[PDB]
Write an enzyme that holds these catalytic residues in place. Sequence first.
Site, PDB file in Angstrom:
ATOM      1  CG  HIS A  41      -0.635   0.404   2.515  1.00 25.04           C
ATOM      2  ND1 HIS A  41      -0.548  -0.835   3.499  1.00 25.04           N
ATOM      3  CD2 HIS A  41      -0.159   1.179   3.199  1.00 25.04           C
ATOM      4  CE1 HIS A  41      -0.079  -0.532   4.573  1.00 25.04           C
ATOM      5  NE2 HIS A  41       0.105   1.037   4.557  1.00 25.04           N
ATOM      6  N   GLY A 143       2.684   5.879  10.489  1.00 28.02           N
ATOM      7  CA  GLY A 143       3.609   5.657   9.950  1.00 28.02           C
ATOM      8  C   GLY A 143       4.186   4.184  10.804  1.00 28.02           C
ATOM      9  CB  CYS A 145       2.345   0.955   7.370  1.00 24.82           C
ATOM     10  SG  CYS A 145       0.606   1.177   7.833  1.00 24.82           S
TER      11      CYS A 145
END
Lengths: 306, 306
Positions: A41, A143, A145
């Site tokens: 993503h 942030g 991820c």
Amino acid sequence: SGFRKMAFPSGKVEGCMVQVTCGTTTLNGLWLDDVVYCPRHVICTSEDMFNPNYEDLLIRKSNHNFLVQAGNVQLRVIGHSMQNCVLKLKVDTANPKTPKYKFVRIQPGQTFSVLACYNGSPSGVYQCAMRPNFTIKGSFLNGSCGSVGFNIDYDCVSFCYMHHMAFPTGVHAGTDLEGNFYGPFVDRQTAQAAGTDTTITVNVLAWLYAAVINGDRWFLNRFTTTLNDFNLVAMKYNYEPLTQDHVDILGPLSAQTGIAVLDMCASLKELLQNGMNGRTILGSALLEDEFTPFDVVRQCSGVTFQ
Amino acid sequence: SGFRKMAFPSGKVEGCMVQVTCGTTTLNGLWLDDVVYCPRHVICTSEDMFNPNYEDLLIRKSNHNFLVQAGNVQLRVIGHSMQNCVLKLKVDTANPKTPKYKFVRIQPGQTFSVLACYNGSPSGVYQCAMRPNFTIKGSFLNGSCGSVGFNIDYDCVSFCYMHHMAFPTGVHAGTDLEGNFYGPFVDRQTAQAAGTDTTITVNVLAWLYAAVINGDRWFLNRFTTTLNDFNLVAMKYNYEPLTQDHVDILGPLSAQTGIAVLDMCASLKELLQNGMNGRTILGSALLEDEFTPFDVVRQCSGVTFQ
């Protein structure tokens, strides 16, 4: 002396975390040998988030669309591919701090250390269990991820989890390092709900075994039970089924303590029906289910990781 | 999203841990620049511990009576001295992995991360509070002495705790890195016990704020209380008295959520007087007191409605 939700030392994994940027999105990747792994993503935008066309987005990407940074050093991307929901960026430099590692897909009930990161920079570490409903109960800010979960077995680091999504539900979901999601989740920013969660029975028992090793023994009784009769009580209190396989996994701890598994199951039956009566076990007023049999052994044995 | 107890990543501290042996005792040391810090009880025999004169016992030691190993690298001891209850071994080699660091004496109610070690090797990491009775709820077996506690601010490791001894109640005591004990404890084998385990009121309140910010609000009531009436209840249940300073520290969380601190106190008053009645808060069946206001804000920061 004492018993805590204890993470693995994070040092080996800290050495593998980098920052990955594409467009306006920055998140974390895992640098192992000459590949960097991150959530695919990263190649979406805001406009795309809700329902991206990953195949199309990837075709249109070239290597120069990606910026990878290990501290301040820019790592040059020489190739890009997508494996399920994970992006893999080939880089020109092998990570010199690459530990011996494997990739494993974990089963529900199994635990791991999460190294929470921001902008390629490790921030925090905590233990999680993969729940029966395939979520984890984490703590992740913007942030995070691409933060990974891992176990250490000898010298070898086993990566089992990468953080992809926080849903407005409160739900944390992610993939193994081959990019397959745990549970029915997808990398689309939309309301997705987990099925109802259950308690991890075998872990509860492992933790009662830890209680006994540490000399907390008040809950033990003289009763016993069959597996089937226990499972008839398991299912009423929203507990996972205890398999015969579980019972045998609780053998080492049964031997070390000299308490038979099915007795410990009897002691558990009683705590479910009658509650704790104001008492605590290992400093908790409920039944803890995020410690595996291995976890108990590890913590009570003082195993180290060099 | 979510809410979890989290430790700092351990990598910077792992690089500092060594093994110190003297006589038949092996425990951990902290290697920073050209000094290795460890508990001075390493110089003693079991017999010596009953009535130790440390100054005398140290005079009879020479530099070669201390074996320091960083992994497999032997480190030559070239000097030794004692600062309060910590031994300082000057070595011929400055630790190349020495991070930026400070030595800090932590206040009760404040938190730090612990890297539990054995034989100078890391076993795991967890977060503790310095409790009002000046103990910590760790997980420490034999060989763990010299394990340290710390906070990381940017790249700077602030060390605040070194592990010296374990109480039979599953709790632990130690010194700062200047070698002064936290609490009225002594490094001799005499009768000693932890004082009453007073609860950190301001942290419990912070944690109730985290709870409502995580959608768990069943415990809110319409009532309010005064500082004085609350403090009467606090005295009865072994909670720290609430101060104006604590009220002010909770200011941000109060402002964000719109729940006045004294209203939250009234909610805490009822919980203490009536208990939880089977229910959980943030997945706990007792009131948690090891999250500071700071820890809460870091995970529960949000918007305020105007």
